[PDB]
From a paper:
These enzymes catalyze the dephosphorylation of ribo- and deoxyribonucleoside monophosphates to their corresponding nucleosides, and also exhibit, in certain cases phosphotransferase activity. All structures adopt a tetrameric assembly displaying a cross-like shape, in agreement with the quaternary solution structure.
In the tetrameric structure of the ATP-bound wild-type enzyme (PfISN1-ATP), only two ATP molecules located in the two subunits having unstructured NTRDs were observed. The nucleotides bind to a cleft formed by helix α6 from the OD and helices α7 and α16 from the catalytic domain. ATP binds at the very place where the C-terminal loop (LoopL430-Q444) is situated in the PfISN1-Apo structure, implying that this later must leave the cleft upon binding. A π-stacking occurs between H150 and the adenine moiety of ATP, and H150 establishes a bridge between E419 (catalytic domain) and Y129 of the OD. Overall, the structures reveal that ATP activates the enzyme by triggering the departure of the LoopL430-Q444 which in turn induces the bending of the subunit thereby increasing the affinity for [name].
Numbering used by the authors:
A (entry chain D), D (entry chain D): 59 to 430
B (entry chain A), C (entry chain A): 10 to 316, 327 to 444
The structure:
Amino acid sequence: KDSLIMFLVEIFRSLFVSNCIDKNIDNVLLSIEEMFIDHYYNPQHSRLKYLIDDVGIFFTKLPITKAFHTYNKKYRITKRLYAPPTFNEVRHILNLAQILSLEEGLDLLTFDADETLYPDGHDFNDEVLASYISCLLKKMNIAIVTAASYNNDAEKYQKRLENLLKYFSKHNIKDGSYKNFYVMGGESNYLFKCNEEATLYSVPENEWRHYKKFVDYDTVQEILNISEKCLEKVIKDFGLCAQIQRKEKSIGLVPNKIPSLNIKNEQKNYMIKYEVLEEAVIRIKKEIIKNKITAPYCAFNGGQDLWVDVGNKAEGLLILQKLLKIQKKKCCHIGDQFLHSGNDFPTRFCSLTLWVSNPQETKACLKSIMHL
Amino acid sequence: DNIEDIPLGSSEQDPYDFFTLSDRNVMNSDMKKNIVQWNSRYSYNQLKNKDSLIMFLVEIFRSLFVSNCIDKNIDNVLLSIEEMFIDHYYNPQHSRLKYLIDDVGIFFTKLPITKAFHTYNKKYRITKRLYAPPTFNEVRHILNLAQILSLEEGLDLLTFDADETLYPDGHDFNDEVLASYISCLLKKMNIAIVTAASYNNDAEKYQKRLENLLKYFSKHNIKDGSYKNFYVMGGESNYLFKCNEEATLYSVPENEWRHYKKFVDYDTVQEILNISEKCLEKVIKDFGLCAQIQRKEKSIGLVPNKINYMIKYEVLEEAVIRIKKEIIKNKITAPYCAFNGGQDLWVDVGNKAEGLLILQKLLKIQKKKCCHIGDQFLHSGNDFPTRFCSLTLWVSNPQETKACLKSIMHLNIKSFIPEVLYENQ
Amino acid sequence: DNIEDIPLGSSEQDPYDFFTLSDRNVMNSDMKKNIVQWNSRYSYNQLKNKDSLIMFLVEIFRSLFVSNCIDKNIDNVLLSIEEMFIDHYYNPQHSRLKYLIDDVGIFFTKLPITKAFHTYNKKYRITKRLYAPPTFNEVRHILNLAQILSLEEGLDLLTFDADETLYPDGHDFNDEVLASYISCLLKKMNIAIVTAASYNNDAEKYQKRLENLLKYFSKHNIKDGSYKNFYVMGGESNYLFKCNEEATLYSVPENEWRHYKKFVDYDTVQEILNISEKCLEKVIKDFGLCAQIQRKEKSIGLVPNKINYMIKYEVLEEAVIRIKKEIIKNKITAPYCAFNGGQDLWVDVGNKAEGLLILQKLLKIQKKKCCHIGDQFLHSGNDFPTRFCSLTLWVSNPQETKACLKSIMHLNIKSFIPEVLYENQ
Amino acid sequence: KDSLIMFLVEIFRSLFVSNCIDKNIDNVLLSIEEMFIDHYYNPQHSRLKYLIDDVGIFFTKLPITKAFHTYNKKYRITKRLYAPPTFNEVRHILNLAQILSLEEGLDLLTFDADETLYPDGHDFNDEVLASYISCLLKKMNIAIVTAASYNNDAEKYQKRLENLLKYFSKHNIKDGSYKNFYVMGGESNYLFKCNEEATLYSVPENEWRHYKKFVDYDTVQEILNISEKCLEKVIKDFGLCAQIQRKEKSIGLVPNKIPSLNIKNEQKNYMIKYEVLEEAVIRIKKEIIKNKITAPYCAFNGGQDLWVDVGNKAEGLLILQKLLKIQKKKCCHIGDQFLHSGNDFPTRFCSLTLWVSNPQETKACLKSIMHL
Ligand SMILES: Nc1ncnc2c1ncn2[C@@H]1O[C@H](COP(=O)(O)OP(=O)(O)OP(=O)(O)O)[C@@H](O)[C@H]1O
Ligand SMILES: Nc1ncnc2c1ncn2[C@@H]1O[C@H](COP(=O)(O)OP(=O)(O)OP(=O)(O)O)[C@@H](O)[C@H]1O
C-alpha cells in the first residue's frame, strides 16, 4: 500500500515472531529513527531511499522511537502473544510520529472534507470534532479542501459546514480566529474565507490567481469534452440508466432515479457497478494521456457517481501555502487514503499527511495536535 | 451427514490478516471494501480462505482477460470447468476438482456454471471492460446464479444466518419487503433461522430480535398454516423455537430433537466457559479494557461498556486465539465456536453448522433440497465450512438478499432470468 | 520413536515448482543456484518447504538488515530466539516455536544459535555487507554450526545419505580425504550409510558403489576392529550390510533386525510395484520415451536408454504423481517412496527415515547421540521429515561435508572453532 | 524473471487447472498472437505494453500459436495431468517463436561465448555444436562475443576456440565462409576475423572505431581506479586472500592460491563467498553512479572472481550490426540469462535474444535455425 507502512509492519513481524517485541527493542527503533533522520537531511542519498524507492521526501525529523513507545504504552500491542502489530497500528504510529515531529509548530492544518468531515456524504455533524477544530483555529490557519463544485456560491458550501460554522459563531470571533479559516472548493478552483458573523464569503479570483498555474479555457473544455465522449460510450457499453452533468470546470456521470418495490421508498438511484465506474475512470485517464494534456486534473470514482474535475486537491494545498507564506515543514494535511485507489497526487509530496479512517481516529489525531 | 463428518476446526486459527479487512471500524463503507479487492497483495489470501472455489474462477478469468479473449467465445473453457463441476457432483471426493481445490466442499446439484456466466455477462457485460478484469464479487454473483439455476426440483428448506443477513448493523429485524419475500417463501418451503445469540431458553428475547418479521407473519402466514414451517435456532445449535397461531416463539421440547445433536456433557460445557472466563478476565486486565463479561448457560461474551466504549480489534483477535489455545491445552474436543464479532467476542458451546444438520434431520429434508443464505465475509470457514451441508448463497447486503429470494420465489418459471445483485433494476 | 509416529506423506505432493529449481540439467552450476536464491519470487516457497526453520531465521535477519542494525548488538534478538529453541527442546510439541513453525521437527539438543551466529559472523562478517542480507545458505551454515556446537556429550552414530553426500554425480565413491575423515570417525563412533539403490541382497553391487571407501578401511580400520562399526542400509530400509575382516560387505541375517522394521506383507509390496509398472508403461507410451523399466525385488525404476537419452524433467514429475495417485486410489498405506531423481525415477517399497530408526534401535543408540548428513536440496520433506530422527546437518557439496566431519572429529576440543563451509581456509 | 515468460506461464496455468489445456485452445493462443503482432506494429501503443510494462520492443512477428503447436506436438506437455507447463518450457516456446519469426531470414547470428560455447569455463569442446555453427556460417554472418580480455592478442583467443576453428579448417574455406566469422573480445573492445588458414587475426582499431561511441582514456582509467579502491576495501572488509589485477580496460578481484590437505591437490584457489562477490559488484555499481559516469561498462560476478570491463556485450552487438550494415529484424543473439543477475543491458533491446542453458538446448535452437 504505502510502502513505508509495509516496511515497518514486516520489521515488527520479525520482532514479534522472534519473541522479543515486548523486550527492549530500542536498538532497532533507534536504528530506524536515525535512518529516518538521515532522510530529513540529505534525502536524495539516504540509505532509506535505497531500500524503499517511493519514500518521497520527509519534511521533518520523525521521532519514530518515541512514537512507538507512546503508542505501545497506551494500547500495549507488544503484550499480544498471537496478534502481531497490524497495518493500521503502524499507520497510527507514523501518524503519531509526524505529529510530534512538529515541536517547532505548524501554521496550517488542512482537511480533506469529503474524506474526514462529512460522514457518509452528509453535512458536518460532530459537535466534538467542531470543538477541536475551533481550538486549533486559534493557534494556526485551518483550511478545508473539497471536490464539491458549486462555483463561487458561498451559501452552497455553507450548508455542508453550517454546524461547524455555527460552532465558530460562539467560540471564534471574540479572539478573531475566524480570519484563519479557509475553504477551497472545486479541488483548487473556488476559495472562501470567514466573516465576523460566521458566514462564508468568496475570495475573488483576482486576489489569489497569482499563486495558481493558469489553465487555458479551451484546455479545460477539451478535458471535459474528452470525458463527455468517454462517458457516453460507457453508458452505451453497459446499458446505464445515467446521464452526463456538465459544470464549468467539472463533468460527471450521475445515475438516474428509477422505481423500487411499492413497499419500499417509491424512488431510488440507479446503481452503477463499482467495476464499471473504475473502468470509466481510467478509460478517461488514458484518453487524457492520449491527448498529451499537462493540466492538473482529477478523475475519481466516488460512491454511486463519477466526477472529472479540472484541478486536484494537491494543487489546492500548494496554492494555500504559496498564499499564506508557509513552507512545507510547518503544515500538515488530514485525509483518508483507503478512499482513493488513484495513487496519483498522493498529497504527501506537498505537505505532511495524516491517514485517518473514522471520526474517532481524526479526533485522536487532533487531541495529539493540541498538546504540543 | 453428521457433525463428526464435517471438517470443523474449532480451535484452529486462520492465517493472520495484517490488514484487518474485517475490522468494520476501519473498512466501514462499500467504497473501501471494493478498493481492497483490487490490490491482490492486500486481500488475496483472505478472500481465497473464505471461498477458494471463487478465487479459483477469478484467477482463470484474470488470465482469459490478460490474454485478450474474455469477450470472445470462451465456451471451451467454461464447459470444461462445468464438466469438472458435474464430475465433482458425482464424486465429491477423489474428483479432479477436489484434487485442485481440497476445501471445495460438496456439490449437491449440477451447477450450470456456463449458463451462469452468460446470464450475468448478458446483463452486466463485464467482458466489455478493457481494464478491470472480473472481480471476486462478480464471480461470487456468478456462483450464486449457478446454484439458483440448479434448483430444478425446488427447495423444501431455506435457512438464513440471522446475524449475517437479517439484522442490519446488529439491530433488530427491520425490512418490510424482505419480510414479504420470506413470508411468501414460508408458504412454499420450510424456513429456519440460525443465530449465535444465546438468551438461554428465553423465547421472548429471541422474538424481540425478530419482532417485525413475526408481525408480518401474523398478517399473511397464519390463515394458511404456513407459520408451522418457521423455525429459529438460537445459541448456534442449543435452543430451538417454533411459531404458534399468535406469531409467538415457543421452545420445542428438547426431547423432540436432542437425539439429532451430538451430546456434550455438562462439565465440558462449563469447563469451556470457565476457561474462557479466566482468559477474558486476563485479557481485560492485560489491556486495561472497559469491558464486561456476559456469561450464559452455554456461552460467554466479551462486551464493551456503554458510554459505547470500543475494544481494539486486535485485542479481540488476540483473545479468540488465547481461548482456543487454552481449550486445546485442556484437550477439549467438543464442538464450540469462539469468534471475534466486529465489536465484541463470544464463545458459544455450539456450532451453526451442527445447527443446520439438526434442522435437516429434524425436518427430514434432503440436502439437495436445502439452501443457506449467509455472508462468508463475516465468518471463518473453520467454523462454518463452505458447502458442507447444503447449497450456500453468498450475500453481502440486503439488496443482494432480496434479489436472491425474489429469484427463488420465481424458481423454475420460464419467463424469469434469475438475479442476485439488484432487486429493482 | 517409531515409523508410525514420524510425519510421512508418502503419497503427498509438494506444491508445484513452476521454476523447476531441482532440474539439474538447467540449474547445473553453483553460480545459477546462488542467483535464484536472491529472487524471492523465484525460490521462496521451494526453500521454505525444505527447511521452514532456516527460512524463519532468514526473514528475521532480513528485517534486522533493512532496519540497519544487523551489525550492531543484536544479542537481544538472538538470545530470545535461543530461548525459544531451548524451550522447544524441553517441549517438542506445544512449544512457542512449534506454534510458529509447525513442521519445525525435534530438537534433541540445546542449540547455541547465538554462539553460532557470532562464530560464523566473526569469520565471514556477513553483517559488514551493506546490500546483500544474510542468505538461505548462510543461515543453513549457521544452523549446522549450532547443532555441531551442541554435541557436548559426543556422538555414537553418524549417518550419511550416500546418494546425496558420497557419490559425486552419481558415480562410485571417489574422494581420498573424505574417506580419511570417515575412517577416523569410524574409530570413534558407529557409521551407517543409507542409499535408495536396491541391488536386491547382492552385497557385491553395493560394495562396487563404495569400493574406494572400503579399500581405505582395509588400510586403517581393520587392525583396531573399527570395521565392525560400519553399516550399509540399501533399498532405503530393506537390505542391511556389515563389514568383515577383509573389508567386504556381507548381508546381516534378516532375523537379526527384521523386528525393528514395520512389517509390509508380500502382496502389498508387489501390488505397489505392479501398479507402478503399469503407470510407467503408460508414461512411456503417453510421451514416447526411449526408456526402460527396471524392476527389483522391492523397487521399480524408470531409467533412460544409453545412447544417455534424457527424459523430460516434467515427465518425471508427472509420473511420480501419477504413481502416488494410483497407489492412493488402491488404498495402500504402506510406507514407500516414489521420487524424481535428476534423470530417472524410482519407487522403493522402503523409506530412508525408517532406515535410520532401524539403525538406531539395532545399535541401541539414543537420538541425542545421532547425527545425519544429507542434502535437503535433493529430497522432499514428506519423504524424509526435517529433524525427525536425529540432529541433521545440511551439506550441499563435498567441501562442506569435509568441513563438518573435520569439526566433528575435533569435537569438544577447546582450541577448535568449528567450520561447516571450507576445509582448507 | 523475464515478465513475458511469467505472462504466459500464468495463462497456461489457468488453462491447465480449468482442464482444457489439452483441447482446442487456439482462441486463446491466436488472441495472444494478434496481441503480439499488434506489438510488432505500433509497439508504443499496444495493449501488450499496457499489460506488461518491461516488454521491450519486438523486432518481428512472433508466431506464438504455431510455436506452441510445434512444441506440444513433440513433447506433449498438454498430456500431463499434474505437471502444468513450466517456466523453462515457456522459455523454449518463445525461443522457438523467435526462430520461426525469421522466415525472411537473418544475416547475423551472435553467441555469448562465456555462457554457451565454453563449458564450465574451459575451451571449446563439442564437435557436434561446431558442426552446426559451420553449417550456419555458410548462410549468415556469425560473431562471437566474450568478456575475456587479452588485448588484441589473437593467439590467446584462438586457444579458447581452437577445436571450433579446427572444424572450420575442414568445412569452411572451399566456399569462403570464413570471411563471415567474427570474434569480439573485451565485451566490445577487440575485434578479430578469420583468415584462409582458420586462424584468428586482429581487425585494427581504426577500421571499426567509427561505429563505437568513443570513450576517453581518463574516464576508463577513472572507472578502473574507482573499482580499484572499492575492491581494496572489500578485501580489507572481509579478510580476503585475494589481490587486484589491472588490465588496460579491465580490473579484477582474483583469488590467491592457498594450500589444501596433503592428500588432496597441494594447491587450490582461495574461495570467495558468492555473497561477498555480489556485495562488491553493486558496491562498484553505486560508486560509478555516484561519479555520474555515462560510459557503458559491465561489472559481473563470474564464478570465483569479479571483473569490471569498460564496454558491455550489448554495445558490441550494436557495433557488429552497425559494421556489417544489418538492422535488428535480421539478427539474433544466443545467451543464458540465468547467468547474469545484473538485469542491466538485457541484450533483447539490441537484437532478438534466445535463452539457452545447456549445450543440448543450444543445438536444438540451431537445428531449428537450419531448417528455415
Ligand atoms: N496516531 C493515530 N492516528 C490515527 N488513529 C489513531 C491514532 N492513535 C489512535 N488512533 C485511533 O483512534 C481511536 C480513538 O482512540 P481512543 O478513543 O481509545 O483514545 P483517544 O482518542 O486518545 O481518547 P482518550 O484520550 O479519551 O483515550 C482508536 O480506535 C485508535 O485506533
Ligand atoms: N526452442 C527451444 N529453446 C531452448 N531449448 C529447447 C528448445 N526446444 C527444445 N529445447 C531443449 O533442448 C533439449 C534437446 O532436445 P532433444 O535432444 O530431445 O530434441 P532435439 O534437440 O530436437 O534433437 P532431435 O531433433 O534429435 O530430437 C531438450 O532438453 C529441450 O528441453
